[PDB]
Amino acid sequence: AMGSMRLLVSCVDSGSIKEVLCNIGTDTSVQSALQPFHVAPHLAEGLKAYVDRMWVISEDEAILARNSGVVELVKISKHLKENEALQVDDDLPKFDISEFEITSSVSDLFDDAKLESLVDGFVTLCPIKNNTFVAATKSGLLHIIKKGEDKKLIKLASLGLKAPVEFLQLYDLEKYIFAYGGEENLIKLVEIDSSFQSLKQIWEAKNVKNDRLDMRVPVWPMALRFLEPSPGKTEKGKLNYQFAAITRWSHLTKYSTQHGRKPFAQIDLLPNREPLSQMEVFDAKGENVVSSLGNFQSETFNELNVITTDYKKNVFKFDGNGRMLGKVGRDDITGSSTYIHVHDGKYLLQGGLDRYVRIFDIKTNKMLVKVYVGSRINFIVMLDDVEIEMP
């Protein structure tokens, strides 16, 4: 029934990826708990070039976007870990570990100067959906990159967008459509034409009205997830996209395009515009309620819950009304939680400045995995392809 899981972890400090094999109940900080079966680093390219985003294509292949400005295609191989003898002068179970080789890459994908009008990095590396990929930047580039018939990467296109970009979420709940936004850069919907040779802007949000002291409410959306389209009777001459976003001034803002370009709610999640980043849909019983790009598979905001993080040490759960549901890992997380991801509905992947990779059960809120990796963490994928061979 219970076979070890396989984590790949972006290790910022040494610009590398670690594979970690471990069961549930693993805690490196408690010597009597299960320890990991295996932990090794791979592909260390240094701090200058740390991994910004990963995507795993399959057991055999993944694609990496790095802060050197470089997207790499990575072949993953497996072999059984041989169980060797300690003292030298038998046949027991074995597990799959990985070897990672870069087969091909693409370069010079940042524009540092385009930001001076602070420094570039990737904020999306998604499939467009199946061998074509989006890799977008803060400088406001949207590169389209394909795995060619020859198995090498080629750049189909580099489309301009308004800088700076915090995120670039593709719509995939039913035309290539995506949202994007950033500091003082209003959420825009964009249609890219199926040849990938151009894009058109189709929607731009409007700011909310001024506040009680008649002062402008600043704009900084940080992350966004689509809901399904508004049900029933709809105006012609207007789009029908629904989406919610978290801002860097502690907003949960909700949008329908049917309603209009202003959000129909911009709720303050926390006091004093406490800065936030990231946004993960989840259902409180651990149900998988999202598309493969994390968009919420529902047509009302009412059933929406999100997980976001502040820049201190906390990981907050909120409902679609801004009502706090609780913190995750309040006793264990001591550093800014740089990466969270809800995996298959029921697990929260977490890692940040405190150098521990963690896995929480969304439903019980229990810590299932704690593994110290000695490095700040900015990404994790969980795999569940472990082979066990018995003798």
Tell me the layout of helices and strands.
Blueprint: E1 5-11, E2 16-22, E3 26-27, E4 38-42, E5 51-58, E6 61-66, E7 70-80, E8 94-106, H1 112-116, E9 122-127, E10 132-137, E11 141-147, E12 153-160, E13 167-170, E14 176-182, E15 185-192, E16 199-204, E17 221-227, E18 242-247, E19 251-256, E20 265-268, E21 276-281, E22 305-310, E23 315-319, E24 324-327, E25 339-343, E26 347-351, E27 356-361, E28 367-372, E29 377-382, E30 388-389
Parallel strand pairs: 3-28
Antiparallel strand pairs: 1-2, 1-29, 2-4, 5-6, 6-7, 7-8, 8-30, 9-10, 10-11, 11-12, 13-14, 14-15, 15-16, 17-18, 18-19, 19-20, 21-22, 22-23, 23-24, 25-26, 26-27, 27-28
PDB class: ribosomal protein
Keywords: ribosome assembly, rRNA processing, ATPases associated with diverse cellular activities (AAA)
Assembly: monomeric
